[PDB]
Design a protein around this nucleic acid. Structure first.
Lengths: 230, 244, 66, 52, 120
RNA sequence: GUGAAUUUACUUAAUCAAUGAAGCGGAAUUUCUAGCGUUAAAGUUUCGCGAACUGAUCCGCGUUGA
RNA sequence: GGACAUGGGUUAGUCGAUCCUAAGAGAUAGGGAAGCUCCGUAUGAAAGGCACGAUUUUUCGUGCCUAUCGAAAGGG
């Protein structure tokens, strides 16, 4: 309680002491690429998005997402190192002259690749389809919900391309497909089919025929709200 | 058959002589302090701007955000003296030299260096002895009707700012020059626009009015607005002509 | 494959989907430079049928001409 | 002296032993001192008047 | 944790700038010193004015390289004749060749040094 | 281009004005004088110019204005 | 003989150039143009710095703010 300390308060009114260092993040002259990112996000919100594009705005729920990804991590495809090891082991088996065709078992893994998955859906071999929500050229997946609906294939739009990529040991995966599983996972798969179809395919539909976008803001909707209430 | 003097005035030797200019006379950039309150500055010096009939005023303000002094170049109004305090903002008083929004000043206020639009730092009533009159306000549309020195009526946003008072240096045109030499010196600091040869004193290759055995035009000197650049000579798009 | 769907969808460029994509893409291409490197083809099957392979040594540039 | 020629003088030859010595004249400094003190007195009085 | 911006400007961040680590040297062999003392000193001058400077001013006059400067001439003279100069003056002759006046110290005799060179 | 009942409105496309793209939209709730104003500090909570939290509200975030 | 021939002759820390900027030239960012090239000079650019720390999850944190050329009479 030394009396030498004293307060010396600063007043930051207009014409008073210099303004303190404030957060100016909403006034920064951002680089051109950052402005491109944010105004593209704003543009997609403002504009009237067609139903075939806005249907990708309705994605899978979190609880359904974690369980389907839990199923997928059991059927990740073999890595390059595992493939080399298996080929080396079977090559030694051939050198020892044993049954190379029966020493190995049929692989059980998720299917990936846009052309491969699309062909599987057309061939009715796909049991579950998971579509990345943000495929940058949207034409690559825009037809997939309609294709899966015609062919009676259960399909979901899951969050983010990278999660599907990490399942298949890639940076990116536009779409993943489950075509065969093991008997212990038949029940878990069927539950995921039921949840996905009920919430996402049997539901919406009327939503995938409706128009997205058109959201004004952030202060113009406050302007209209003030005008309407006045 | 030759490019005429009017056409050649697109630059080069017809540029403005800008060595001795003392800065561009502008209001403060419209900031938060001047939008919501007032900021006080000190008149440091009243200076002569070469080529300008009115004096300039160097006014030092404080940067509201940094420890530095911002010096602004104003068009001096009559009665401005060195050491005077000038207040700019919405809550500024109605005193000569203060910069206020036109919407905050009563009808009939004499103002100068008025802004055409909010934030362009001064467009109207800038020459010596000239001023703008606040005819009235329209609060619903947020506009202000003002009388310009040409007598025209103009609408400006109520947030546009204007300096209270008349631009200093009035009566500068009353004195006859008496001299080509004094007209030479006046225009020597402005541009190459003097002396002026008449078109009728030229040759046909040089001007529409040139040629002929007697110095005459031969056609009407009132010309349309759609005419070509080489044709826009004399009285362009004159509604009335002659001395009343 | 999906390239067949991409081709027949690109034929329909007066559809609502293509009109919306044309609006947003034209806006963002104007915001970039006149000549700017494209990270990937915006029409992968159009590039594919014209000779583009997706391996090192192949490059895509976007350019707007008045 | 010329500007570069000032660098060869010692500090006392380029300054006056007073506040702002070598920057302001004696009368200018005195006006600074009186004006500072008087306006500080004014704002103290105005603070007393407006605090109540 | 949102980063606070107090400048209203975005200034390009500083990134690591690795130094060059070439897989090969672009030149296999480094060039020899292009200007050594045998190229710096071309010839002495034995004209009558050159002799006069030798016998009175204790100064040696040399035809030197164009690229030679005062420092290189002093080092060349010191290394070629074991005498240290105290002063060097240079001029480009109207024929395009450089000529250096080399004032030796009182420790050295310009007459003697001229004799060892052989042009005296 | 998007709406609301030729009639009104909106802004994201484009146009214009300003700047160092500082205080925009919501909610919570400095004028007797040619002076100086920076390099926080008191308050609170941990542990000396070491910290933290406020001093200096929150939220949205579309740099503002036409 | 300013001609012809033969030689010789111009020595700088202090005198200038070099340095600075002037009017003005002129890259860069960008935008035009079939192009040669044009416009543009802090502009619609991510246009660079400086300081503190027992060493910080031995994978860096916390703060603070414009080329060049162009004067042997200009400046120095």
């Amino acid at each position: 309680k030394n009396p030498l300390f004293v307060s010396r308060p600063r007043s930051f009114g207009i014409g008073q002491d210099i303004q303190p260092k404030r957060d100016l993040s909403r006034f920064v002259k951002w680089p051109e690429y950052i402005r491109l990112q944010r105004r593209r996000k704003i543009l997609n919100l403002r504009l009237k998005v067609p139903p075939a594009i806005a249907q990708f705005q309705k994605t899978l729920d979190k609880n359904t997402a974690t369980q389907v990804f839990k199923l997928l991590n059991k059927y990740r495809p073999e890595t390059a190192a595992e493939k080399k090891q298996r080929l080396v082991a079977e090559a030694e088996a051939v050198a020892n002259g044993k049954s190379a065709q029966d020493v190995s078992k049929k692989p059980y893994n998720v299917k990936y690749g846009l052309n491969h998955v699309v062909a599987l859906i057309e061939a009715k071999k796909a049991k579950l389809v998971l579509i990345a929500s943000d495929v940058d050229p949207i034409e690559l997946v825009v037809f997939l919900p309609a294709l899966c609906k015609k062919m009676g294939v259960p399909y979901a739009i899951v969050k983010n391309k990278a999660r599907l990529g990490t399942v298949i040991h890639q940076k990116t995966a536009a779409v993943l497909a489950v075509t065969e599983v093991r008997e212990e996972d038949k029940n878990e798969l069927a539950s995921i089919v039921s949840a996905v179809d009920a919430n996402f395919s049997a539901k919406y539909d009327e939503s995938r025929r409706k128009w997205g976008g058109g959201i004004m803001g952030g202060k113009t909707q406050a302007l209209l709200a003030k005008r309407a209430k006045a | 058959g030759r490019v005429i003097r009017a056409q050649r005035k697109s630059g080069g030797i017809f540029q403005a002589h800008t060595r001795l200019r003392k800065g561009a006379a502008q209001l403060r950039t419209l900031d938060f302090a001047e939008r919501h309150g007032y900021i006080r500055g000190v008149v440091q010096k009243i200076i002569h701007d070469p080529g300008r009939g009115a004096p300039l005023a160097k006014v030092a303000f404080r940067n509201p955000y940094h420890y530095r002094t911002d010096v602004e170049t104003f068009v001096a109004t009559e009665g401005m003296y060195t050491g005077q305090f000038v207040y700019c903002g919405k809550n500024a008083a109605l005193t000569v030299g203060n910069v206020l929004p036109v919407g905050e000043m009563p009808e009939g206020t004499i103002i100068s260096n008025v802004e055409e639009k909010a934030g362009d730092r001064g467009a109207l009533g800038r020459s010596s002895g000239n001023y703008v009159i606040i005819v009235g306000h329209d609060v619903d549309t947020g506009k202000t009707r003002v009388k310009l020195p040409s007598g025209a009526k103009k609408v400006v946003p109520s947030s546009a700012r204007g300096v209270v008072g008349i631009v200093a240096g009035g009566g500068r045109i009353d004195k006859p020059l008496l001299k080509a030499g004094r007209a030479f010196h006046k225009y020597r600091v402005k541009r190459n626009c003097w002396p002026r040869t008449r078109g009728v004193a030229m040759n046909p290759v040089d001007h529409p009015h040139g040629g002929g055995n007697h110095q005459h035009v031969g056609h009407s000197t009132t010309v349309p607005r759609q005419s070509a650049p080489g044709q826009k000579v004399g009285l362009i798009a004159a509604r009335r002509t002659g001395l009343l | 494959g999906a390239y067949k769907y991409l081709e027949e969808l690109a034929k329909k460029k007066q559809s609502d989907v293509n009109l919306f994509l044309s609006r947003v893409r034209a806006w963002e291409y104007r915001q970039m430079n006149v000549i700017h490197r494209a990270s990937r083809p915006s029409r992968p099957d159009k590039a594919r049928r014209l000779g583009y392979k997706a391996k090192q040594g192949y490059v895509i540039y976007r350019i707007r001409v008045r | 002296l010329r500007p570069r020629e000032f660098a060869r003088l010692s500090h006392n030859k380029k300054t006056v032993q007073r506040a702002y010595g070598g920057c302001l004249s004696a009368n200018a400094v005195k006006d600074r001192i009186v004006r500072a003190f008087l306006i500080e007195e004014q704002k103290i009085v105005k603070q007393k008047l407006k605090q109540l | 944790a949102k980063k606070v911006r107090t400048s209203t400007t975005f200034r390009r961040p500083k990134t690591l700038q690795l130094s060059r680590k070439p897989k090969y040297a672009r030149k296999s062999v480094a060039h020899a010193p292009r200007l050594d003392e045998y190229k710096i000193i071309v010839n002495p001058i034995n004209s009558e004015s050159a002799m006069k400077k030798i016998e009175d001013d204790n100064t040696l006059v040399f035809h030197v390289h164009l690229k030679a400067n005062k420092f290189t001439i002093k080092e060349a003279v010191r290394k070629l004749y074991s005498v240290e100069p105290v002063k060097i003056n240079t001029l480009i002759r109207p024929n395009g060749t450089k000529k250096a006046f080399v004032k030796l110290s009182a420790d050295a005799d310009a007459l003697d040094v001229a004799n060892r060179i052989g042009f005296l």
